[PDB]
Amino acid sequence: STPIIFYDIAQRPPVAETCCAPNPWKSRLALNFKAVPYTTTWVKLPDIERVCKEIGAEPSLLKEGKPYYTLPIIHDPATDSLIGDSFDIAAYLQRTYPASGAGDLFPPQKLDYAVGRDMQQLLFPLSEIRASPELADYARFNSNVDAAFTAHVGLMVHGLPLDPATAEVTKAEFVRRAGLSSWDDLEMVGEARDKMMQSFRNMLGDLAALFRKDASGPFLLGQRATYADMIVGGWLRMMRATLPVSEWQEARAWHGGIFGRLHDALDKYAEVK
Length: 273
Prior knowledge:
The protein has helices spanning 15-18, 22-34, 49-54, 86-96, 119-123, 136-150, 154-157, 167-177, 184-187, 190-213, 227-242, 245-253, 258-265; strands at residues 4-9, 38-43, 73-76, 81-84.
């Protein structure tokens, strides 16, 4: 009678079928993989706040210097811990339940994606803190993947669920906030969308190199899943929920079908309990 409480973002009813926030999906995949009992509290919030909690920039390494929590949040009665931030949640789960579920979320592996892309901050660090060894490669991958998908999030904006009673009003505030004239701008249509789609496909191409290397299965380590697969997998769950049907089908099929097969392989961990 003490399961983990998992705070997730309520979308449109039925909340279990419409959930689309990428960071909560990452943690949900990790929780299901670890087979640790949890229950979901579905947080209701107005448009704009919900968009902000869903995507939208973190305040700007170690939680011992962060006074804040982003969603998802877990309360674990077993240790009376309260943890925000998907990455800290995955780390906590593996530290606290190392032998439970499907195995180890964080085995040693090479995550050579976007190496050197952060050169400006390596020369000029915003903090000499954290970089918790053993996890440093996974934390860097999480940061880089998040930045790469966030650079393409305009493709998913049309599909971000809005309350039909406030939708028109919130649409009219986002435009204005931006110096724009239409919701068609922002939402992205026509040539700007075509160019973003091509960029997105190129971005997934670089990411796909890592999932190609061990071709014996869809995960980075072949048939063995890790948290790094779930970092990407959470964004795929958001894409599935928010891209137009035709565009999700194209993206599933780019690069010989790599991300389609990864998405399908994560189905076993994707139960919305």
